[PDB]
Each structure stands twice: as structure tokens, then as C-alpha cells.
């Protein structure tokens, strides 16, 4: 039950009680306790020197679980409600109506740090790549676009974190009791998240496609191909993101769009992502086959394993292990394991790629060494 739904139900119950108590006749008993509302239930007139039994409220979140039970409150003979033990409040009994995150915190503590380090490494790597003009080429342009996608994905995650923290902060909950839970900015933030994630996935796909084209020994016009790649990367996700927003706004607009109810309206922003991951896995397989052939033609397993490990973080094939385990069928410890794996690996993938393709890269070290030598020539 949504918090706003609970508030609406309680307001409806309060309105019903206020309407009824004006219409409720006196109990025809002398010194009868006056019917009162204590923000929890409606108390009819209480007979003198007797307990008053009232059915448990139905608007409570756990009302369906335990509809039985009767809240008890004592009324004195003189018409005054019996005072509770050493307290001003009248004696009341509510235990009958009373109802009978560590892993999430661990996950958060892990991948927040992972994303922070990944962003910190990616910014420096991009700065170094843009520094030297010698390194400029199509490959490095595609790499820079990938870095930008990763950085945007991290920033969107941070913004979503801030929004969730603000929504359920003390002040916000007190205001909602009497908010951001319905403002448009929340929906915009979530949509921006849905788009950044899709763009990152499609730019990994672009990496894979460009590498495959290069290794297929084919030549194409550079300018047209690069423009087409940019369009594919930053443009395609809009096609399957906008209709999702339209459907949410026209049929299922409630609670910041945070919770997805109809899987039909959810698979739209999931199917293309799986398509891209499958394509990248195919590219990984073919590239590994070619590398194996080259190594065989000219201790082999050591170098082959090094190459495969270095290739993993570029195309992000680690996602394929649990890619097709659908959300609808994730229960028990399987869901926890899947979330842990994907969150940690995705958080650290940015750092992996940055360090692998910017720092240890041989030409980068050569550039640093010769720059230092030139500095020391003076």
C-alpha cells in the first residue's frame, strides 16, 4: 500500500467518523462517555463504569492480515474516560490490532564506491586522451563516446540516489503526512536514468560493431560511417524510451513511475538491452576465434587468457552470465546473487576499461616518457 494511499484511506475514515458522530444518537445512559476521535479510531459513546469495544480499523496496512480484534478503552462511571496507568492519556489497549534491508545496505555501500572510483578514473582517462593530439583517431573517438556514456550513467545513478533519499527523509514524510512524490521533476529524473542506461549499453554495442568491421577486412567511407555510428549510439535509445514514457504517462502514472506493475509496459525498456548484450557476446566470440587462429598459426594459453581477460571489460560480456534470468523468476538467494554480481561488476567496469585502455597502454607510457625527456632536454 502506498503511503499516499494510506493517508487517503485514513482521511476517508476520519471523515466518516466525523459525519457519523454528529448523527450518532446518545447512548441513553446517564454520565455516558462522550464519543471522541483519537486519530486512530472512532469511539462511540462509552457506557459509565464499563469498557468500550470498537472493531479494529479497516484502513490499516495490516487490517486485511488481522481483521479481527477490538480496541479496548476504559470509561469511568462519571462519563470521563479512565486515565491510563500513571499517564494523562485515557487507558487504551491496542496490542490486539498491532501487526505481528541489511543486504540492500551492503549492496549500496559496495556499488556507490565502485561507481565513484569508476567515474574518478574515467574523467582522468578522458583528460589524458584529449591531451595529446597524436593519439587522435576514430578508435579514440569511439572510446571517448564510451567514456561519456559511462560518466552519464554514473551521474544519473547518483541523482536517483539523491532523489530517493529526499523522498523518504524525515521532513518529506512529515509534509506528506499533512510533495515531491508527484512533481514532474521526479519523472524527468527517472526517464533520464532509463535513457542513460540504454545509451551506455548501445555504445558498448557500437564498440563491438566497429571492431568487428575492422577485423572483417572491409573499408568504408570514414565520415559517413562515423556519423552513422554517432547516430546509432546517442539516437537509437530515444525510439524505445519515448513510447515507454508515453505509456506510463497515459496509463500507469503514479508514485514517480518508480514501481512497474504491468510487465507489458516494462519489457519495452528491457528487450533492446538484451539484444545488444547478445550481439556483443557474438562479437566477443568471433574476435576470440580470430585471435586463437593467429596465435596458432605463428605458453599459448597464458597469452590467450590474458587477451580474453583484457577483452572482457571492453564489451562487458560479464552481463551475459545472468542476462536472461528474467525478473519474474528471481526469488530466494538467486535474486540476491544476481543483484550483487551485476551491481558490483557494472560499477567496477568503468574503472576496468579506463585503466586498461588509457594507463597501461604502451603508446601512452611512451608519450609520457618522451614528454618527460623533452622536459629534461632544457
Amino acid at each position: 500500500v502506498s503511503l499516499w494511499e494510506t493517508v487517503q484511506k485514513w482521511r476517508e475514515y476520519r471523515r466518516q467518523c466525523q459525519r457519523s458522530l454528529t448523527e450518532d444518537p446518545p447512548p441513553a445512559t446517564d454520565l455516558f462517555c462522550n464519543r471522541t476521535f483519537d486519530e486512530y479510531a472512532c469511539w462511540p459513546d462509552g457506557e459509565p463504569g464499563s469498557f468500550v469495544n470498537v472493531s479494529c480499523p479497516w484502513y490499516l496496512p495490516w487490517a486485511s492480515s488481522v481483521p479481527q480484534g477490538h480496541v479496548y478503552r476504559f470509561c469511568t462511571a462519571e462519563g470521563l474516560w479512565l486515565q491510563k496507568d500513571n499517564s494523562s492519556l485515557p487507558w487504551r489497549d491496542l496490542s490486539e490490532c498491532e501487526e505481528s534491508e541489511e543486504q540492500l545496505l551492503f549492496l549500496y555501500i559496495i556499488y556507490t564506491v565502485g561507481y565513484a572510483l569508476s567515474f574518478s578514473a574515467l574523467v582522468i582517462a578522458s583528460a589524458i586522451l584529449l591531451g595529446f593530439r597524436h593519439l587522435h583517431c576514430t578508435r579514440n573517438y569511439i572510446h571517448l563516446n564510451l567514456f561519456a556514456s559511462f560518466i552519464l550513467r554514473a551521474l544519473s545513478v547518483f541523482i536517483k540516489d539523491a532523489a530517493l533519499k529526499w523522498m523518504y527523509s524525515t521532513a518529506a514524510q512529515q509534509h506528506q503526512w499533512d510533495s515531491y512524490q508527484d512533481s514532474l521533476s521526479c519523472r524527468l529524473v527517472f526517464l533520464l536514468m532509463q535513457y542513460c542506461v540504454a545509451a551506455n549499453y548501445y555504445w558498448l554495442l557500437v564498440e563491438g560493431v566497429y571492431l568487428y568491421t575492422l577485423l572483417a577486412f572491409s573499408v568504408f567511407s570514414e565520415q559517413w560511417i562515423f556519423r552513422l555510428y554517432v547516430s546509432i549510439g546517442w539516437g537509437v535509445p530515444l525510439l524505445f524510451v519515448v513510447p515507454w514514457g508515453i505509456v506510463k504517462y497515459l496509463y500507469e502514472d503514479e508514485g514517480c513511475w518508480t514501481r512497474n506493475s504491468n510487465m507489458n509496459y516494462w519489457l519495452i525498456i528491457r528487450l533492446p538491452i538484451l539484444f545488444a548484450i547478445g550481439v556483443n557476446f557474438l562479437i566477443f566470440v568471433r574476435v576470440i576465434c580470430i585471435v586463437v587462429s593467429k596465435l596458432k598459426a605463428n605458453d599459448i594459453k597464458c597469452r590467450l587468457a590474458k587477451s580474453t581477460l583484457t577483452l572482457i571489460p571492453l564489451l562487458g560480456t560479464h552481463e551475459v552470465i545472468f542476462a536472461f534470468v528474467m525478473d519474474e523468476h528471481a526469488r530466494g538467494t538467486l535474486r540476491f546473487i544476481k543483484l550483487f554480481t551485476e551491481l558490483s561488476f557494472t560499477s567496477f567496469q568503468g574503472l576496468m576499461v579506463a585503466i586498461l585502455y588509457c594507463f597501461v597502454n604502451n603508446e601512452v607510457q611512451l608519450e609520457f616518457r618522451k614528454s618527460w625527456e623533452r622536459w629534461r632536454l632544457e
Binding site: V1, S2, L3, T6, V7, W10, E39, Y40, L60, P61, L94, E99, E101, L104, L107, V157, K160, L164, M167, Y168, Q173, W177, M193, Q194, V197, Y201, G255, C256, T258, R259, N260, I269, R270, I273, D327, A330, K338, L339, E342, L343, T346
Partner: peptide
Amino acid sequence: HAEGTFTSDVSXYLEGQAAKEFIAWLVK
């Protein structure tokens, strides 16, 4: 994406807990 299912569960958790806290405040 896993970054989108975890957010929905957390929003689960809080909606149930925030509602319980609100009801407790009302009772008190």
C-alpha cells in the same frame, strides 16, 4: 537492468516502512 529492479524493490521496502511509521505516529 539490475540498476532498475533494485530501485523498485527499495521503493517496496520504504512504502511499507514509511506507511507503518505514519500509522505508528497516528496511533501515538
